[PDB]
Every structure is written in structure tokens, then in C-alpha cells.
């Protein structure tokens, strides 16, 4: 290929004047056919990237620039499309600021100063917007996570004014984008939901999905619209997609739907076709079913069987919810539980502090986890992660490791020092540390003094059984401060004003000291 070799050489040496469209065409033919060694050759791609960086990318669409950048990144060249400036005074048009926002959204490089500038050049010319342009700019602003609620409210009012000129998809997209905006007013939301429910008989499944997402985001303040959509969709329940059924479950859990008659129908329809769900959708369906108190003997088995085919490659952020669901439910889940423990053992390296703490906490009281090899690995990993644990993640990890019988005095001492650095606010944030120390039953006297000084103010808000547990922990640790026992006895006196031998031995010993 003498001609091909010459062309490649001339491209490599940066001696060819390339336009943005030519680079786009070369990228497309390299990514589609790739009969030649274009992507495999590094020098040619480096030369093409050098030509693209110095070119004029205004003559290509944001999608084309994004595709060029993706093609360059697929081989290793760190490429990023240029940022377009705000149009000048003559080119200030409703169709150009929307283009600026669209390019900012597509290329995934958002500048808030540019957003403010194009939001201040849109207000004077806001009267020139087409009905669809408003529904486009609302979603574009929502996808940029803008915090300007007044502009979105004005846009929503205008969208309401041109109701008859908009399709169902535009109305649903405007509704969901409005629901995603945090600071928007509630009267506008009520008007939009009324508009949606008036034009609700034309909805496609995509519009159903958008409306369900909007309702879930808004919350249980909008029960009437959810009731209307539940009553309408009862005809389509059998012939319905799985994802929208999962969204129905999520909305049912969120709104606390007391009408448990249609919930059974929708749940049965979901469990019929639950085989066609991905990781996130299946996890959300599990959580929604648990929070609605729907896990029966048979549907739990089918959902667990569906989870089995996914448990091998679950994300580290989707292991704790399934463990919690299995823990709360009283049915048989030994096989799924073992697979999840194996996956957690595999993922122990990348697990963060919170996820590791949750995994340890769920398996604190699990009998089969006592002899499983995850205990030592998780203990070492928690000791490593102890610097990054928070006030609650540390407590969860300590509770899980103490309940599992993992014995390592150094880890519990370091946890005590970390807790002293953070400080304690609830008894549930201090008890796991005490039982972890009592597992080994040894600590320096300064640790005992600090623990007692933390416990003493907290003794005025403990139940009698918790006082018994605290006294047990303090006796095991070997405390001798008198004010702590004074406060404990003072609290005990209120519940049992009688010093009669009726109370157990520990109580008489406590009040004696």
C-alpha cells in the first residue's frame, strides 16, 4: 500500500490541512469499519488529534465533537472538545442560547458563569420562544442541576399558557424536569400535575415513567395524582413493562399507599416478569417490596432466584441492601447469602468505609458468618480504613466485628482513640466500642477514665436494661471512678425505688457502690 503509506505518513507529520468535518469523517470510518490499522496505529491517531485540537470545531454538532472525543479516548489520547463562548449581541436568539446549553450538557463540561450569562440574556427575549423551545430549555436547565428556580417557574408558567400546542411527551418531560428542580414553588407543581392528569389518557410508557419519577421525587404531598394514575393504569397492569412496574412499586413505597387492594395486583404483575430486570431495578424492586410488607413465601424465592444470576458481579453498593432484605425476612436465603459473602470477600479491596461498615453490621448476628473467612479480611481492612470511618460507620464496623467474635485488642484500642477524637452523642454510638473492648477485657487506665467520663453524662437517659449492660461492660473493663456509679445508681433508683432483694444481685451491688 504505497499510496496508503504515503497518506499515513503525511497525516503523521502534520502536513495536511484538516477541517473539523474531515476529522469527523475519518473518526467515523475508523470507528465503524476499521479495516485498516487506523485505531491500532498510535502515531496516526496522535497526528489526527493534533489536527483536531487546532481545528475550528464550530462547524460540527455537539454530538459529532462528542463522538470524536470518545474515539480519541478509546485509544488513550486524552481529548476534550472546545468550550463555545456566549453569542455576541447580534446572535442573541432563542435558538442559540439553547444551543449553548445543549452543547454544555452533551459534552459534559458545565460552567456556571456561562449558565448565568445565558440565563440573563434569555429573560428580555423570553417572549420569542416557541412552545417546544420552552419545554426543551426546561429540561436542559434541569439536566445542568441549575439552582435558579424563578427562571424555571416563569418557563413553567409559559408552558402552561401554551398547553394546547404541546404533545404528551413534552408535558411529561416538563413535569419531571420541574419536579427535579429543588427550589421551585408548589402552586406551579400543583398546576402542572393537574395539567398532566387532564391530558393523562394519551400517555406512552415513557410518559408513565417520567410521571412516576416526578411523583417519587415530589413525595407524599401529591397523593391524588398517584391515586389517579393507579386507577387509570389498572387496565394496563397485565400488559405492562417491568421497569414501569418497578417504578409503581417505588411510588407505592414512597406514598405509603393504604389501599392495599391494587398493590397486590401490581406486585403480582411485577413478580411475573421480574426476570427482565437489571441490577438497579431488581434492587429497587426488592426494597420497595420489603417496605410495603409484601415478601411472601413464594415471591421471595422467585426474586432470590432472579438475584442469584446477578449476585456474582454485583456492584459494591448493591450488596448491603440485599443482605438487609435477607436479614429482615424470616425465609430461607442461605445460598444467596453465601454467594453475597463470597462477592463481598472478592470486593473487600474497593469497599469504602460506609459500605464495609454496613456489610459488617448486617452480618453481626449471622451464625454462618462466624466461621466464614471474611472475618479476618474485613477486620484488617477495617483497621486500615479506620482513619476514614465516620462517627456512625465506625460504630457499625465495631459492632459487627464484636458480634462476630473477631478478637484484636489493637483494633479496638485504635477505635477507642478515633471515637475520642470524634466524640459520642448516642448510647448506640458508644456501646459497640465498649463490647469490643470487653471482648479482650484490657485497656489502659486512661481509656477507662475517658470512657467513664463519656458515659456519666449519658446515664440520665438510659433504660434499666441498658444500665445493666453498661454496668456489665464497666465491671469487665475494670473502672473505679465513683461518680459514674453514683450516676448509674441515681438513674436506677427512679425505676426501682425499693432497695428490696427482689432486684437481681447486680442491682444491689450497683446501688451499694
Amino acid at each position: 500500500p504505497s499510496a496508503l503509506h504515503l497518506i499515513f505518513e503525511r497525516c503523521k507529520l502534520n502536513l495536511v490541512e484538516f477541517t473539523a468535518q474531515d476529522v469527523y469523517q475519518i473518526c467515523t470510518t475508523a470507528y465503524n469499519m476499521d479495516t485498516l490499522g487506523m485505531l491500532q496505529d498510535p502515531d496516526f491517531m496522535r497526528g489526527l488529534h493534533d489536527a483536531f485540537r487546532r481545528s475550528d470545531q464550530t462547524v460540527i454538532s455537539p454530538f459529532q465533537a462528542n463522538l470524536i472525543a470518545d474515539t480519541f479516548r478509546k485509544v488513550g489520547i486524552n481529548s476534550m472538545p472546545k468550550e463555545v463562548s456566549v453569542p455576541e449581541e447580534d446572535a442573541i436568539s432563542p435558538e442559540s442560547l439553547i444551543l449553548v446549553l445543549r452543547n454544555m450538557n452533551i459534552t459534559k463540561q458545565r460552567d456556571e458563569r456561562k449558565i448565568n450569562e445565558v440565563l440573563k440574556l434569555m429573560f428580555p427575549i423570553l417572549d420569542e420562544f416557541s412552545p417546544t423551545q420552552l419545554s426543551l430549555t426546561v429540561t436542559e436547565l434541569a439536566r445542568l442541576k441549575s439552582t435558579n428556580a424563578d427562571f424555571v417557574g416563569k418557563l413553567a408558567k409559559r408552558i402552561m399558557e401554551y398547553n394546547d400546542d404541546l404533545s404528551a411527551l413534552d408535558i411529561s418531560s416538563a413535569a419531571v424536569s420541574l419536579a427535579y428542580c429543588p427550589g421551585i414553588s408548589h402552586n406551579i407543581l400543583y398546576r402542572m400535575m393537574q395539567i398532566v392528569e387532564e391530558r393523562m389518557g394519551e400517555f406512552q410508557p415513557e410518559d408513565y415513567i417520567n410521571v412516576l419519577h416526578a411523583l417519587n421525587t415530589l413525595g407524599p404531598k401529591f397523593v391524588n395524582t398517584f391515586r389517579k394514575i393507579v386507577e387509570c393504569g389498572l387496565q394496563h397492569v397485565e400488559n405492562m413493562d417491568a421497569v414501569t412496574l418497578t417504578n409503581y412499586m417505588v411510588c407505592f413505597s414512597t406514598m405509603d399507599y393504604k389501599q392495599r387492594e391494587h398493590i397486590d395486583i401490581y406486585a403480582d404483575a411485577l413478580v411475573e416478569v421480574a426476570t427482565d430486570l437489571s441490577e438497579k431495578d431488581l434492587v429497587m424492586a426488592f426494597i420497595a417490596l420489603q417496605r410495603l410488607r409484601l415478601l411472601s413465601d413464594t415471591m421471595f424465592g422467585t426474586m432470590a432466584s432472579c438475584v442469584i444470576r446477578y449476585a456474582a458481579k454485583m456492584d459494591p453498593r448493591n450488596i448491603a441492601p440485599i443482605m438487609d432484605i435477607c436479614s429482615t425476612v424470616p425465609h430461607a436465603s442461605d445460598h444467596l447469602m453465601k454467594v453475597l459473602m463470597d462477592r463481598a470477600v472478592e470486593c473487600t479491596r474497593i469497599l469504602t468505609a460506609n459500605q464495609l461498615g454496613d456489610i459488617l453490621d448486617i452480618l453481626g448476628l449471622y451464625p454462618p458468618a462466624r466461621e466464614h473467612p471474611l472475618v479476618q479480611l474485613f477486620g484488617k481492612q477495617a483497621r486500615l480504613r479506620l482513619d476514614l470511618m465516620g462517627p456512625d460507620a465506625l460504630a457499625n464496623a465495631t459492632r459487627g466485628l464484636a458480634n462476630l467474635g473477631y478478637a484484636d485488642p489493637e483494633y479496638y484500642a485504635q477505635a477507642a482513640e478515633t471515637g475520642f477524637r470524634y466524640g459520642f452523642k448516642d448510647w448506640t454510638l458508644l456501646e459497640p466500642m465498649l463490647m469490643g473492648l470487653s471482648i479482650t477485657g484490657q485497656c489502659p487506665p486512661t481509656m477507662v477514665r475517658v470512657l467513664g467520663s463519656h458515659i456519666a453524662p449519658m446515664a440520665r437517659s438510659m433504660s434499666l436494661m441498658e444500665i445493666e449492660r453498661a454496668n456489665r461492660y464497666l465491671r469487665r473493663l475494670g473502672c473505679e471512678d465513683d461518680f459514674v456509679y453514683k450516676a448509674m445508681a441515681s438513674r436506677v433508683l427512679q425505676f426501682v425505688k425499693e432497695v428490696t432483694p427482689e432486684m437481681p444481685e447486680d442491682l444491689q451491688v450497683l446501688l451499694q457502690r
Binding site: F123, T147, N148, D150, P182, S185
Partner: protein, 416 residues
């Protein structure tokens, strides 16, 4: 003999002085024409001719500096005035970007060379820093070295008064829209000279006294070394114009020196004005509230606390009756004045309330019907509550207007 190369910042006269004298005379004439105006096209013709002459002179100076090693043979005063004119002609828009950058790059290079030698006195550092940061010309090494050398407070101990005043005014005037990265070095320049200002407290004149205090306060700096600087002003009230007493009250409040005794004199001096304005009344109300919040019901003189409040209330009424002469620019001023009056239970005549609410109605009769253009919803709610407390018969139009505005939703939220 050693080859020292130190020349005083303020003999060794090169062609730079001759170049700069022409610029000085041309700028002086172009400035004098502005005073002569108070034939706009006619005087614009002379302005254009002078601008072209100055541009040609600066072009010749830049070419001479580039071609010939004149900077090394130059002294220091000529270098400083060259920097001054290079920065000053740009804000007057008599130079282009290319020429300005070409001159200032060489100026910074020569300044860095002299700093490396060590011949930069404690005054030249301040001069270069103030005339560079206010022009917002960024050179990394120059900025870093100046910021590091402004931390040797032992050097800046015997600076002259005139240089202190010049730097203070230069930093004060161009503070309004300065870039954020300049603020920290501005504060460092102000603080390096703070001790010298402190020992200069008993030497300033009163307008310059307030100028320096306002310059330090607007740069969110309240150093302790300038503590006497305020005190003398507190002990020298009665020589100030009525308008200046408002800024003096604000400065004293921000300096933790506002007490009852000085507040009485400040309120009295404000009351001697020919006609009140929004600034004076607002400052008086804020000062009255601040002093009213400084009495304790269980303190050393808790029994004597009740008369003091009464006294303050009386002084409040002194401003309360003269509340119609002012012209409110924005709603927050009205809201602050009314809130101060209501919280302290000050008595206000019905005529003053009528005028205040009429101006408020005329102000809110812009945001909702024009709708082209920032009154937040909470501010409108506070205004409605105030009107309801004082009665809706005062401004019947305003009540309905606010109600229809809240129904419509024209007023945005605070979160937005």
C-alpha cells in the same frame, strides 16, 4: 571601590525624564480641558490631538527601551514614574494592548532584576505593588516576591505621610470592581503600613482620617494598630459634615467603639443637617438599635437601664418625625428603618408613615407591571406585616397590590 547601584526612589537623569515630561504636560493639558468644559466636539478635537501626541511619545519611549540598554543605565525615580504613566494611560485608554504589555513586561523584568540585586527600598516595594495590583497585571514571580517582601514589618516603619496617603487613595478608589485575586495582596499592602498609620494618628486631617478609615474598612481590615486612629475621630465630632457622620457611625460600629455617649453626639450632629437623606436616617437608626442592644437588665446598673432606653427612644423619635424628607432608593432601606422603629417601639407620626408607604408603593409599582428589569417574597411578607400592624388605611392601594402580587407570584424566593 565597590560598584553599588542604589538610587533614591524619590541626578542620574537619563532620556526617560525628558520622555516623561512631555507626557506629564500633555496629560495636564488634557485634564485642564475637562475643567474648562465645566464645544464638546471642539474640545474632543484637542483631546484627540493630545492623545495622538502621547501615543507617539510612548511609542518612541518603548522603542528606545527595547533597542538600547536604557533601563540598566536608568535611575529609580524615572523608572517609577515610567511605571506610573504606563499604568495611568491605560485606564485613560490612550494605549493599545500590545504596547502596554510590551512596556509592562520590561518594567517587571527590570524591577525583578533590581529586587534580585536588593536595591528595592521599603517604599519602592509598596509603590510597585500598589501600582501593579491596581492595574491588575499578573506576573507570577513578581507577585510572589512582593507578597513575601510585604511580610517584613520592620522595614515599613518610617514611611512618609504623603506616600501613605497616596497609596491609601490609590487602593481605595479602584476597590469597587477589583478582581478577587488582587484582594489578598491589597490587604497585605494595607497591613504592612498599618503600624506607621497607627503612629500617624495624631497627624492626619479629618477628611483624610475618614478616608483612611474607610479604606481599611472596605478591605475588611480592622487592625488594632489603627485603634487610636478611630478614637481621635470619636473625640473630634462636631467638625464633620452631616453626611460624613453616617459613614463615621458605620465605621465606629464596625470598630467596636460605638457607645451611648458617642451615639448621642452622632445623632445630634445628624439632626443639624439642612435636609435628611436615606443614608443619614438609616445610619442613625442602626446606631440607635446597636446602642439599645447594649443595655443589660441584670448588670451593674440594671436599675438605671430603664431610663437609658427611654433616652434612646427619645433620640429615635428625633429621627422619627423627620422621616418624610428622605428619598428611599430601594425597599431594604425602608424595611430596615421600619424594623428598627417597630422593634424599639419608637413613635412615628402618621404623616411620615404615609409618605414612607407611598414611596414604597411607587417602588413596588415597578417590579410587577413592567416585569422587564429584586424584591424577594420574604421582604414582601415583612412589608405586608408592617403595613397591617400600622393599619391598611395608610396605603389602601399598597395592601391590594401586595395581595395580588402574592397571588400572582411575581416576587421570587430567597433560595433563587
Amino acid at each position: 571601590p565597590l560598584p553599588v547601584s542604589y538610587s533614591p526612589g524619590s541626578v542620574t537623569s537619563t532620556a526617560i525624564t525628558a520622555h516623561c515630561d512631555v507626557l506629564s504636560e500633555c496629560v495636564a493639558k488634557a485634564d485642564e480641558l475637562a475643567v474648562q468644559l465645566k464645544t464638546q466636539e471642539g474640545m474632543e478635537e484637542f483631546v484627540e490631538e493630545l492623545k495622538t501626541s502621547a501615543t507617539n511619545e510612548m511609542t518612541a519611549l518603548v522603542k528606545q527601551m527595547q533597542t538600547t540598554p536604557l533601563l540598566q543605565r536608568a535611575g529609580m525615580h524615572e523608572l517609577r514614574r515610567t511605571l506610573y504613566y504606563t499604568t495611568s494611560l491605560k485606564e485613560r485608554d490612550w494605549l493599545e494592548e500590545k504596547q502596554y504589555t510590551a512596556a509592562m513586561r520590561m518594567l517587571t523584568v527590570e524591577v525583578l532584576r533590581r529586587d534580585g540585586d536588593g536595591v528595592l527600598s521599603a517604599d519602592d516595594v509598596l509603590y510597585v505593588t500598589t501600582h501593579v495590583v491596581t492595574a491588575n497585571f499578573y506576573n507570577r514571580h513578581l507577585w510572589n516576591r512582593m507578597e513575601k517582601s510585604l511580610l517584613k514589618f520592620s522595614n515599613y516603619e518610617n514611611i512618609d505621610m504623603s506616600s501613605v496617603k497616596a497609596f491609601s487613595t490609590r487602593l481605595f478608589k479602584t476597590r469597587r470592581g477589583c478582581a478577587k485575586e488582587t484582594l489578598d495582596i491589597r490587604r497585605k499592602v494595607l497591613l504592612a503600613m498599618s503600624r506607621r498609620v497607627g503612629v500617624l494618628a495624631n497627624d492626619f486631617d479629618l477628611p483624610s482620617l475618614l478616608g483612611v478609615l474607610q479604606c481599611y474598612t472596605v478591605h475588611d481590615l480592622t487592625p488594632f494598630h489603627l485603634e487610636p486612629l478611630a478614637i481621635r475621630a470619636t473625640n473630634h465630632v462636631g467638625d464633620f459634615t452631616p453626611h460624613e457622620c453616617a459613614t463615621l457611625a458605620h465605621v465606629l460600629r464596625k470598630w467596636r467603639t460605638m457607645r451611648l455617649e458617642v451615639c448621642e453626639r452622632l445623632v445630634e450632629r445628624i439632626c443639624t443637617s439642612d435636609q435628611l437623606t436615606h443614608h443619614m436616617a438609616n445610619a442613625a437608626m442602626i446606631a440607635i438599635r446597636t446602642c439599645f442592644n447594649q443595655v443589660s437588665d441584670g448588670g451593674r446598673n440594671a436599675m438605671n437601664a430603664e431610663p437609658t432606653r427611654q433616652k434612646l427612644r427619645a433620640m429615635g423619635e428625633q429621627i422619627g418625625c423627620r422621616l418624610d424628607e428622605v428619598e428611599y432608593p430601594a425597599l431594604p432601606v425602608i424595611l430596615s428603618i421600619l424594623d428598627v422603629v417597630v422593634t424599639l417601639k419608637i413613635y412615628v407620626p402618621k404623616k411620615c408613615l404615609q409618605v414612607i408607604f407611598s414611596q414604597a408603593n411607587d417602588m413596588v409599582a415597578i417590579v410587577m407591571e413592567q416585569k422587564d428589569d429584586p424584591i424577594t417574597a420574604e421582604e414582601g411578607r415583612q412589608l405586608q406585616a408592617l403595613l397591617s400592624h400600622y393599619g391598611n388605611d395608610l396605603a389602601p392601594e399598597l395592601s391590594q397590590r401586595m395581595k395580588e402580587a402574592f397571588r400572582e407570584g411575581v416576587l421570587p424566593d430567597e433560595a433563587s
